[PDB]
Design a protein that fits this description.
4 copies of one chain form a homotetramer. The first copy, chain A, is globular. In chain A, the strands form 2 sheets. A 7-stranded antiparallel beta sheet of chain A has the order 3-4-5-6-7-8-9, covered by helices on one side. The first copy, chain A, contains 3 helices and 13 strands. The two termini of chain A are about 20 Å apart. The longest helix of chain A is centred in the middle third of the chain and has 12 residues, at about 90-100. Helices cover about 15% and strands about 40% of the residues of chain A. The first copy, chain A, has a single domain, classed as Glutamine Phosphoribosylpyrophosphate, subunit 1, domain 1, CATH 3.60.20. The first copy, chain A, has helices at about 75-85, 90-100, 165-170; strands at about 5-10, 15-25, 30-35, 40-45, 60-65, 70, 110-115, 120-125, 130-135, 145, 155, 180-190, 195-200. In chain A, strand 1 (about 5-10) and strand 2 form a beta hairpin. In chain A, helix 1 runs antiparallel to helix 2. By secondary structure, chain A is of the alpha+beta class. At the A-D interface, helix 1 and helix 2 of A face helix 1 and helix 2 of D. Strand 9 of chain A pairs antiparallel with strand 9 (about 135-140) of chain B. Chain B: This is IMP cyclohydrolase. Chain B: Belongs to the archaeal IMP cyclohydrolase family. Chain B: It catalyses: IMP + H2O = 5-formamido-1-(5-phospho-D-ribosyl)imidazole-4-carboxamide.
């Protein structure tokens, strides 16, 4: 039931999207911050220091490069987004980044999860201590994946017609309500006019 | 389910008799082929008088099995040497397979044929595949062997694979167990290790 | 004085080009055959068998994909060209392919050499047993590289205004005359109308 | 005369080493901190906040894995070390990490530089906007490389018989005295008994 960090990607009747939600046991003093073309996961005021005791807690979790949205549970968000910007198809951007960066070297060998979507295709990947897998997101249905328990894409009837909605949904909505220790959430949505960002706190 | 033609098939794992990797060609338009054991490897080559086939299709001849030290590599194409070499030059199994599938990619033919592969040694085993919809490399479950093919069965599938010798294993993936049902069997090869070392073997239809 | 296989890439007053030329001691029974969008290095009639005794002799030495031309001394030619086709900048297409394929496992640990060019940039790389290097081709001057001896880019006042010209030059022209054991050659040229292929025999 | 971040690697009469030195114009409020099996570049007390305005200033510069020492100017220090730890040869570890992570997306397209050394070989590599290069370190002589100006290996008569010496030298000694804006320095030395770490401030 505690899935750790969760991300979602796909298309529904209202447009394309990516959603991210932090779930933590020992580092709840965090929030999401919208900056130019990106959403970062940072410590809340007075906890800046946390970053220096654990290197996997702060990072951009959503990057927007052109017509492409990138979402991941770590710094690989920039590694992948940079490859997209510099010209590289989605699948390889994810694969090359997950292969090189690998699972996180902590207590639980925490997988690095990620996904990216543009006007044509979307891909979702994950790298664990037991494997690496990058796959196409089925057009007929959005999907989500997490660091713990749900280590492989799972379909989700994800309704949302705005980044606000998406971000709230992965936080407290639908089936995500049953996953524990929700901290902060974020998302990007594109109804065809471009990517818009939004956050959502508990 | 309607299709029983899986194309090229490979299997890997450990049973009560030891470790192994098996491979079997299945073709519709290039049956003029067989497996030839050479030093530390098994190649898939045209049969005499068909040497020419290789120049009309670059995906029909390749080492399908490579042995490097305590490690056995198996695949449906030239990546067999790309992976084997990385293992030889020092690279863990998962990465070796993954870096090689990522670079080489699915085969650029009529059916965007996936590149499949697997490798095993004294400690772990990893199986992987690269298609036009993805790339996947995963640890082979210790409690059960598994197999994968270019068509239909594009993700690992468990198999009660019995055999206690390369001869046995190569025969099994060719005509035994559930592999019987997969059509157009051409040639087969395999590598087995009972703890003494890797031994190769071929099997014709 | 025997550089093995040699390739050249760059631009001159007449257009963009890539050139290739095989140089062999023990496998001269070879020629270059133009096919759709590519030039392959194959055994001469009655030698089809050679390929089974050495896996590094037959291969497409030039691939044209869109506005981009790819040239190498091996099968990586297709690895790199596919990544360009599927969308991947030139530097990475060459780098990823060279890193993964590595030097050829023969008597001389023969390096894998490659280059790619389009209307904007051009890159040349090589992978040996002592390293890996991929670099931008200097706009103000073509350059060449070979499997042996000249294992790093070298400038070349390369004149030619057609594939025919280019293929003949790298084979018997300029400084390439002094490099021994010339077997067959090939080249692609682009004067602004598209890529055109041409072979040249001794 | 400002080479940015500089690293050195090689063997001398006293043993094997890797040295690192930060040089900065706009972020001198930094020091090096030894922690388990590694040395990190971090903000000085009261500047924790800098980490959030620039994602390229805090990182482990040195990582020790077994008989191998890794040094770099970025997070790729862990990317490379982890691959080495998980079983990967030095050349590929550096090449796969530099290919995936790329030059740093800042004002100067700052290259990612790196090097690794164990009881047998040593390799140094760099990734820029113009290329990628990874090469074996010449056994008969140590070499150093930087982000700016000296973007290619360069020989250095690097004398030192202890991490303290090594660290001091890349900071204020020899030819490094002439490189400007020294902030902090660090190094790992191995005289055959194992890898020892040390830092040095201005």
């Amino acid at each position: 039931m505690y899935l750790g960090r969760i991300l979602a990607v796909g298309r529904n009747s209202n447009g394309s999207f990516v959603a991210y939600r932090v779930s933590s046991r020992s580092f709840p003093n965090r929030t999401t911050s919208i900056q130019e073309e990106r959403v970062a996961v940072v410590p809340v005021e007075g906890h800046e220091r946390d970053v220096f005791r654990n290197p996997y807690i702060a990072y951009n979790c959503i990057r927007i490069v052109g017509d492409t949205a990138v979402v991941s549970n770590g710094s690989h968000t920039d590694t992948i987004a940079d490859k997209v910007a510099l010209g590289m198809n989605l699948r390889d951007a994810i694969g090359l980044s997950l292969l090189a960066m690998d699972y996180e070297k902590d207590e639980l060998n925490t997988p690095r999860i990620a996904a990216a979507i543009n006007g044509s295709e979307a891909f979702i990947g994950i790298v664990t201590a037991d494997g690496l897998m990058v796959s196409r997101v089925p057009e007929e249905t959005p999907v989500y994946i997490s660091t713990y328990e749900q280590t492989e894409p799972a379909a989700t009837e994800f309704k949302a017609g705005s980044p606000e909605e998406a971000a709230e949904f992965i936080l407290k909505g639908g089936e995500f309500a049953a996953f524990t220790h929700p901290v902060t959430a974020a998302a990007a949505f594109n109804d065809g006019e471009g990517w818009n960002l939004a956050t959502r706190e508990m």
